[PDB]
Ligand binder design. Structure first.
Ligand code: HEM
Ligand code: HEM
Ligand SMILES: Cc1cc(N)nc(CCc2cncc(CCc3cc(C)cc(N)n3)c2)c1
Ligand SMILES: Cc1cc(N)nc(CCc2cncc(CCc3cc(C)cc(N)n3)c2)c1
Ligand SMILES: Cc1cc(N)nc(CCc2cncc(CCc3cc(C)cc(N)n3)c2)c1
Ligand SMILES: Cc1cc(N)nc(CCc2cncc(CCc3cc(C)cc(N)n3)c2)c1
Ligand SMILES: OC[C@@H](O)[C@@H](O)[C@H](O)[C@H](O)CO
Ligand SMILES: OC[C@@H](O)[C@@H](O)[C@H](O)[C@H](O)CO
Ligand SMILES: [Cl-]
Ligand SMILES: [Cl-]
Ligand SMILES: [Zn+2]
Ligand SMILES: [Zn+2]
Ligand SMILES: [Zn+2]
Lengths: 411, 407
């Protein structure tokens, strides 16, 4: 089967054959599209096919499909599974796997960069202190004094599901949120629940607007343990505006390193429940989502008030005006401080080039339009008019529930 | 069976049961989501008729009544004998309102029950079509206080006698390929303009020439008519702060009137069913003005604003976009022509969606179209999960008639 996508600005048509390798399910059926739904121990039996599918893909990528090395690796893994009920990836397969999970991440507009990912193998890690050390090293390597480098750190895989490695933080670096008795929130409302857990685990909260959360790290299914990232490793950018000198007095800053720490990496049927990965920001993530979402820092009113916009009616587009100025400020600040950031015009133009290249060289590029289109100025970016096909390829990154919901407490 | 949708800003959760009554296919499968693809006999007709008449009688609280059974009987008899049937006026009005109610891509559905339905099933000629359309246009326009309306021409019979409006909207601007290489006017309408000229239209060859109607009655070859200039309300575009803005010479028409879609009710197909509402500001200022394949004015505006156009990261495009959209809204408001901004429209849709969930058990919605083309996440629809599915009565896309018509 060939599936066509059209771009409605350019009339360019592409043909997808890669979807034929799709395996997992979308949530959609012939009767219902779930395209805007955010969330729409294995057996030896199911595992060897998953292993084999992966190793066939790996060995094809290196032009060794069907080689003795390929056949021998299949035999080796087969016997490891039947004898130990799981298997270990070779380092090269781990690197390939992690790179492909990113390449396959359909919500990620930054995938042009997928082949340039530093993979840190932390499968020898045994303790939460060990995890803390690996995470500091990742942070320092990825930050690179503002010249950001993409990285992933991979902790030991799931065994029986009772010995999971987990990072309880949603991101390595994130700000605390504190619900006040009057119902207001100090800091970042997205992180209230996790902040409460940290405090219950013994963190002494500074109780300010931008407190970097401690790491809460679980090794080998044990109860998690608190660690503070050395402050000198957390690069932050104070936010100012190129023309509005009062913008700085809003007291805003953000951290430079976006590092997702709550997802599960599946490679060849193996599950890496702790696999923190990081890149660099697209400006709208800070300027649109983190600052202007109503359930986040929610700064639109204050900015608009300081700008003396007409706020009596929505039709003056005061919210749109303030939004643009905040996003200008974020890009200006990061650039002035020499911290890697990409604007949404650059990011989306690069994604479309990536996507076209993928169609030609790979036969497709699964993409989730809902997430790929930027949260402001959508239609003036080249992704808006691009038709996309969303399907799930493995290796992959997957959502997993927050660990406090599932963890069996030891005491 | 029971499906939940969550709002990620407000944590509010809603349960959809209405999707169980969905019928047409989405284009998606369990393997591949096509959510972002724009276009993804006697035996068949009676189940469709029955399904519709059942919902109708249910809606007037007379389900299973003798008048219900008698009507099903009557329609059955009519299909067996004529191979089609005629809707009662009451059923026609209901079906048209519900086709709007069911339009998953429409953000303006809070208005669905206030639709003026003009029954043009007695129309027989292209001239008759023109009269009906001028009357629709004048009624809907209403000196700028716009009123939603649909005009419904005779249903499809054997498919060789279709009524069609060849225009994509009742009011739209011509587009002309220039010897220059560029496009004068609206590039969206280049092909249709050519057909008009080929059919004999004398084109003024300007930037905003209102297209003539090309009307097809009874499967006959389509004929040209010019809408009375005085029935076409237009708005010159100015900005409340930028004096130079008016000198771009921009204008738009007040009446958005889709004329190329097919209305399906109870299995019957109305291939000519122009309908109209009023604009959301971004439709003109973001889409019509700023799409690269449309009037594409971003560069000229940014230039007049003297923005740094050297690097994308100055966000000059975003700045010019906002200003263009401010001017569209200000111009329509100053001339007292109905228009809605995207903040107000999306807020009203969320309110409508909650109503529909509570009263109907759901509201099919296509997030890709419902989220405005600018400032998406600061509107209340962005964080709203939506379920997309197809209910009948419905409005369907149909191919442009020049691909299909035999002359
Ligand atoms: C290098 C620069 C990168 C940029 C500019 C970038 C940009 C983005 C953006 C804007 C999103 C969606 C956020 C939203 O719409 O709310 C996203 C999501 C995502 N990215 Fe990338 N990203 C980058 C690197 C990476 C890396 C290194 C990985 C993994 C190795 C990755 C994997 C993902 C995944 C799995 C998602 C979905 C996240 C989720 O479901 O929560 N990205 N990225
Ligand atoms: C009264 C105010 C109305 C508003 C503000 C409104 C708004 C809109 C908008 C913004 C779109 C999509 C435009 C885009 O995102 O590019 C749309 C699409 C649509 N609307 Fe509404 N509309 C209104 C009236 C109506 C009426 C009266 C009907 C039918 C009686 C209707 C049926 C539809 C349909 C079928 C679509 C999808 C059209 C297509 O597929 O091309 N709308 N509307
Ligand atoms: C319920 C739920 C499901 C899901 N799949 N993801 C989320 C979190 C979405 C999310 C929120 N803030 C931030 C991110 C990070 C996106 C991101 C990741 C990377 C690696 C780089 C970059 N520039 N940006 C992701 C929530
Ligand atoms: C667990 C959880 C709870 C909660 N209340 N909110 C969240 C974050 C939801 C959220 C809000 N804004 C942004 C995102 C990023 C994901 C995202 C979602 C959509 C719909 C579009 C798009 N471009 N990106 C996610 C997560
Ligand atoms: C290939 C294709 C498929 C499809 N279903 N629609 C289209 C046209 C989409 C389209 C473009 N401009 C304008 C409209 C009309 C939208 C519209 C309709 C009404 C009635 C009111 C209002 N405010 N806005 C629709 C193209
Ligand atoms: C027949 C036809 C050909 C062509 N090349 N373009 C078109 C118009 C395509 C088009 C471009 N921008 C906007 C729209 C409106 C429909 C629309 C599409 C999407 C993806 C989001 C959204 N909010 N609204 C339609 C139609
Ligand atoms: O405060 C807890 C939240 O940060 C957490 O539930 C996240 O939203 C979740 O991990 C999704 O990223
Ligand atoms: O030139 C004709 C086009 O406007 C026409 O093909 C439309 O794009 C089509 O009717 C869909 O709106
Ligand atoms: Cl957002
Ligand atoms: Cl658009
Ligand atoms: Zn958001
Ligand atoms: Zn789908
Ligand atoms: Zn567009």
């Amino acid at each position: 089967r060939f599936l066509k996508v059209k771009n409605w600005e350019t009339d360019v048509v592409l043909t997808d054959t890669l979807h034929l390798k799709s395996t997992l399910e979308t949530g959609c059926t012939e009767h219902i599209c779930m395209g805007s739904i955010m969330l729409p121990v294995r057996t030896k039996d199911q595992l060897f096919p998953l292993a084999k599918e992966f190793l066939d893909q790996y060995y094809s990528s290196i032009k060794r499909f069907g080689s003795k090395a390929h056949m021998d690796r299949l035999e080796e893994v087969n016997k490891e599974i039947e004898s130990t009920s799981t298997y270990q990836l070779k380092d090269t397969e781990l690197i390939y796997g992690a790179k492909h999970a990113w390449r396959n991440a359909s919500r990620c507009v930054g995938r042009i960069q997928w082949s340039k990912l530093q993979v840190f193998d932390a499968r020898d890690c045994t303790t939460a202190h060990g995890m803390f050390n690996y995470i500091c090293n990742h942070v320092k390597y990825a930050t690179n004094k503002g010249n950001l480098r993409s990285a992933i750190t991979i902790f030991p895989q799931r065994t029986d599901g009772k010995h999971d490695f987990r990072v309880w933080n949603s991101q390595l670096i994130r700000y605390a949120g504190y619900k006040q008795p009057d119902g207001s929130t100090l800091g970042d409302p997205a992180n209230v629940q996790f902040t409460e857990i940290c405090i219950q685990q013994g963190w002494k909260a500074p109780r300010g607007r931008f407190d970097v959360l401690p790491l809460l790290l679980q090794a080998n299914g044990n109860d998690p343990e608190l660690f503070q990232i050395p402050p000198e490793l957390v690069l932050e950018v104070p936010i100012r505006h190129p023309k509005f000198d009062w913008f700085k007095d809003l007291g805003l800053k953000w951290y430079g390193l976006p590092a997702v720490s709550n997802m599960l990496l599946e490679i060849g049927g193996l599950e890496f429940s702790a696999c923190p990965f990081s890149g660099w920001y697209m400006g709208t993530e800070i300027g649109v989502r983190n600052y202007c979402d109503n359930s986040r820092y929610n700064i639109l009113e204050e900015v608009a008030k300081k700008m003396d916009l007409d706020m009596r009616k929505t039709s003056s587009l005061w919210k749109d005006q303030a939004l643009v100025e905040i996003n200008i400020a974020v890009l200006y600040s990061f650039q002035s401080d020499k911290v890697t950031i990409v604007d949404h015009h650059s990011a989306t133009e690069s994604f479309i080039k990536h996507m076209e290249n993928e169609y030609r060289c790979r036969g497709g590029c699964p993409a989730d339009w809902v997430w790929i289109v930027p949260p402001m100025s959508g239609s003036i970016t080249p992704v808006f008019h691009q038709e996309m096909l969303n399907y799930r390829l493995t290796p992959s990154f997957e959502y997993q529930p927050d660990p406090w919901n599932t963890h069996v407490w030891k005491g």
